[PDB]
Structures are given as C-alpha cells and as structure tokens.
Paper text:
[name] bnAbs show outstanding breadth, neutralizing up to >98% primary isolates, but have uncommon features. Notably, long heavy complementarity-determining region (CDR) H3 loops with aromatic residues at the tip facilitate bnAb binding to the hydrophobic [name] and nearby membrane. DNA sequencing revealed [name] was from subclass IgG1, whereas most [name] bnAbs are IgG3s. Using X-ray crystallography and cryo-EM, we determined the orientation, angle of approach, and composition of the [name]-Env interaction.
[name].[name] (hereafter [name]) was chosen for more detailed characterization. Notably, [name] neutralized 100% viruses at ≤ 50 μg/ml (n = 130), with an IC50 of 1.43 μg/ml. Crystal structures of [name] unliganded and with MPER671-683 bound were determined at 1.45 Å and 1.98 Å resolution, respectively. Strikingly, their variable regions, including CDR loops, are in nearly identical conformations (Cα r.m.s.d. ~ 0.2 Å), which are both similar to the [name]-bound [name] (Cα r.m.s.d. ~ 0.4 Å), suggesting [name] is already preconfigured for [name] binding. PO4 and SO4 ions were both bound at the CDRH1 site of the [name] structures obtained in lipid-free buffer. Another SO4 ion was observed in unbound [name] proximal to FRL3 and interacts with P59, G60, and R61. As this anion-binding site is absent in peptide-free [name], despite the crystallization buffer containing SO4, this site may be induced by [name] binding. Similar to all [name] bnAbs, CDRH3 aromatics were crucial for [name] neutralization, but the observed pre-configuration of [name] to bind the [name] and lipid heads on the membrane may explain its faster on-rate compared with [name], where reorientation of the CDRH3 is needed.
Author numbering:
A (entry chain L): 1 to 27, 27A, 28 to 213
B (entry chain H): 1 to 52, 52A, 53 to 82, 82A, 82B, 82C, 83 to 100, 100A, ...
Write the structure that this text describes.
Amino acid sequence: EIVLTQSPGTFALSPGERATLSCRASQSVSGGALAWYQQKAGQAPRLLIYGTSGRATGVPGRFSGSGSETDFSLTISRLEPEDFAVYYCQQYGTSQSTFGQGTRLETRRTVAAPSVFIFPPSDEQLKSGTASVVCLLNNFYPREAKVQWKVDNALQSGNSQESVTEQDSKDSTYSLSSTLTLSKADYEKHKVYACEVTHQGLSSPVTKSFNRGE
Amino acid sequence: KVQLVQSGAELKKPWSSVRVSCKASGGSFSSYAFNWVRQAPGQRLEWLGGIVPLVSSTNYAQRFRGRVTISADRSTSTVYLEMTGLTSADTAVYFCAREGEGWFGRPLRAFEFWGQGTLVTVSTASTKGPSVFPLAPSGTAALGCLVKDYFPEPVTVSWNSGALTSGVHTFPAVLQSSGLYSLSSVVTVPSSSLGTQTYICNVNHKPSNTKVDKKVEP
C-alpha cells in the first residue's frame, strides 16, 4: 500500500500565524489525487482540499494545498481560533486509498504551572473493597507533565491511569486526572498518600499528600 | 443539501458480526460512491471500502478483505456495512462518507459528505451502570465525582443540573484492565462557597439507562 507520513506530529502556533503541514507518500501519488481533512473532537472529518490544491465548497481562502510526486503540503495562511484541530491527508490515486496518521495543531501560549489537588478514596467506595486515589493537575501549559504516585514513600508504577482534557478554548491550557487504584486491604495498611508533579512551569516538583484517617 | 444519517451505537461480543446503516438524502444516490472509514479512540482514520450503488460495484481495503461486505438499497437510499469476526481491535467509530459533486455532475472521489459516525464497541464485558463516588474538597477549592466501572462508552456529566459551567473539566474515560471504563469530572469553586453552596454532579449513562445525581460535600 501507499503509506502517508505526516509532519509534524503535534505542534503549536498562535492565531495570526502561518501553518504549514506536510504529507509524504511512500510512492508517487497518481495525478496528485491527494486530499486534506480537518477533524475536531467528536466530529466527522471535514474535506478541505482535494486534488492537491482544489478547495472544497465552504472552505475559506486561507486554506491552500500544494505539492507533487511524494511531497504535499497544506498551508493555513493566517490562523484563526477555529483552525486548531487535527488534520489528515489522504491519497486516492489508486483503488486502495490510505490516510496519514494525523497532525495535531494546538494553540501556543505562555508556560502555566499546574494547580495540584489530591483526593482520598470515599468511605462509600471502600465498602466495595477497592480504593481509588485521584490527583488533579489543573490548567497548565504545555501538555507534557509527569505524575508520580507514592504510598509511604514507595513509588507506584503500573497501577495508575491518567487522561488529559482537550486544550481549553478560552485559556489554551490542559488539565490532567490520574487515578491510583489499590485494594482496600492495601490502602488501610499505609498512611501517607502522595502525588508528585513535575512540569516546566515548576522550578521544583510539587507534592500534594494526605495521611489516611486524618 | 446532502445528508448522511447513520444507525445507532452497537455493542458486540468477540466473534460476532455487526451491521451498520447509512441513509442518504438531499441528492442523487446511485451514481455516487459511498465509503466506510473507521477510527479507533485516539487513532487515525482508516478506509474500509466503498460501493457505487448504480452498478453495485464494490472495492475493499486489503486488510479487511474477507471480513467486510458493503451493500446498498436504492429503494431506501441506504448503504450498509457488515463486518464479521469482530475482536476488541475493531472497537471504533465507523463513518460513512460520500464522494463530492463537481461541475457537470462528475464525481469528485474525495470524501465530501460524512455521516455522524456510529460507535461499535467489541468486548466480553457486559453493560453496566457506573458507581459515582465523591471527590471531596479539602482561595480556590477543587471538588468532583469519580464515575467508576461502567460499560460501554459514553457517559455525560453536568454540575448542578447545568447551573454550574465555569471551571468544569470532564476527563476522557480510561479503559481499565477489568474491561470497564472510569472517568472523573471536576470543578474549581471559591473555598468560601463550600459552607453555603450545594454541589451535585449529574451523571448520565445512556447505554445502561442509568442516571445518578451525586451530592459532593466537604
């Protein structure tokens, strides 16, 4: 099959700036049959560009396409807030159509340190035999952050899961929630529960903790 | 205006088959090609195959050849996708898409019109409503709800029946090793409000017809 590789994977720009997204094919795309799509969270993809440089109905002039052979580009001449989304290329020059892996275009802003909160498991949950401990990292930028769970100073690894919100449309920050899961039996055997957070906006890691019972 | 409307979410056990429909309206049907494209959570778009209803000609992606059948009903302007031998790897949103129209009625080939998508979840897990636990607050305080052990996706969360929107963050669910999902929803509020204001998270899990209103106290 023809493999499409997009670049960059994820990058950040500000409204007003010019964005250039790239799509490289493993073989030449026949007739320049290369399309670009925009996709926002929860939506179906939206056709922007077809046949390398053709623009779909309803698509603003700030979007343009170029390229030939194996190298193609989507240019957004002057970014608007509505333009921050995921973008996909697609080749349809052969019967076996393929898509690139996607490029996420996010909004650049100044560094913002997370506000950190820790939550003990509820008494209600403890009745069921399982304890969930939750750590919240609120309104930070950039997206990269590290959470380290500690139970009586023992580093926990492999027993937590985390997820991150979409970039906030107003302040362009992210938030992160991490849940540490332990049995009630293990939870009741230990005292100090801590979430240690590392982030570019923090000169040194921040730890929030609680003592079980207190 | 061309509109593609797909059938509702599906839940399947492994080994089983799934049939998804896509009804087209507002334009010519048989002449243009309809395609199916899927997207696993957080992953890329993947083309499955297409059909031109007029001549019933089909074209399938090599990786899915033998597992996928696409058909069309001209009398109802509906196209169908059937996928067999389902495994958890097939959990994805499935989209139907139609080629565009050009000057003098010539087909575009690029996918101009799209359905809303259909979630197909494949798992051994059984439908289960969530347990909702408080994330209790300790100038700004955070509180929330932990929506644990539900299946399948999705769940929605509001606060104070829609009266509280500022500072709300509802996180993407995680899939636990148990095969059940869990998500959290939080809100930041003035610490001074903790003694006076009531906070309730409203959780709706449509797949199990479960609704929960959970008061969160300090």
